[PDB]
Design a binder for this molecule. Structure first.
Ligand SMILES: Cc1nnc(Cl)c2ccccc12
Ligand SMILES: [Mg+2]
Length: 208
């Protein structure tokens, strides 16, 4: 297991997200679904010039999986996935400019719901999650698990669990007072409201 420090600016964003009083927390789900949809668009487009990129799975979809026993909500896609370099460096590097503009917009009147307009909506996960685990598989790399409970650091390890073929699973370990996002009716409400026009089938799994 390798442990890394977030860039100062990303650490600052995450603390803002964790510490700021802001009741409209449901926006995290829209942001993660939007990210999944962008990742599905990417693999679809790449597959037009190299059909073999779909050898790791033809199905292009999003699954939402609540689990009350583990207190987790998982967002799963069969999109392009992320490489080790994406997890450790590339995505954070790109998020730096968006983060700066976002925190400038907040002290100038914007609110946290606009986070996705700055390309850094992934970090809205920390509105509801005390820990985020991301399991991911890109065609050009191995399966990895990224994980962070914030506080300035994250880990990356090669993942030994079940192979996923290609795509990304974002596992939200929910805060004690955010278990409403495990309820079927609440999830349905949020998806209908914010994600009605996404172009991939979204399947909300039911609990056993
Ligand atoms: C910036 C960013 N966006 N999406 C995901 Cl899934 C990320 C995962 C790890 C680190 C940064 C991410
Ligand atoms: Mg970083």
């Amino acid at each position: 297991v390798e442990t890394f420090a977030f860039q100062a600016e990303i650490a600052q964003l995450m603390s803002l997200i964790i510490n700021t009083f802001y009741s409209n927390k449901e926006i995290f789900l829209r942001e993660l679904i939007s990210n999944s949809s962008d990742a599905l668009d990417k693999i679809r487009y790449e597959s037009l010039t190299d059909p073999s990129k779909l050898d790791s799975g033809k199905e292009l979809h999003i699954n939402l999986i609540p689990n009350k026993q583990d207190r987790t909500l998982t967002i799963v896609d069969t999109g392009i996935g992320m490489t080790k370099a994406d997890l450790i460096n590339n995505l954070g590097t790109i998020a730096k400019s968006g983060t700066k503009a976002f925190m400038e917009a907040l002290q100038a009147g914007a609110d946290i719901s606009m986070i996705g307009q700055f390309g850094v909506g992934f970090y809205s996960a920390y509105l509801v999650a005390e820990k985020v685990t991301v399991i991911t598989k890109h065609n050009d790399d191995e399966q990895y698990a990224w994980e962070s409970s914030a506080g300035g650091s994250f880990t990356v390890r090669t993942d030994t669990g079940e192979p996923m073929g290609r795509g990304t699973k974002v596992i939200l370990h929910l805060k004690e007072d955010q278990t409403e996002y495990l309820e079927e009716r609440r999830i349905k409400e949020i998806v209908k409201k914010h994600s009605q026009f996404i172009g991939y089938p979204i399947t909300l799994f039911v609990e056993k």
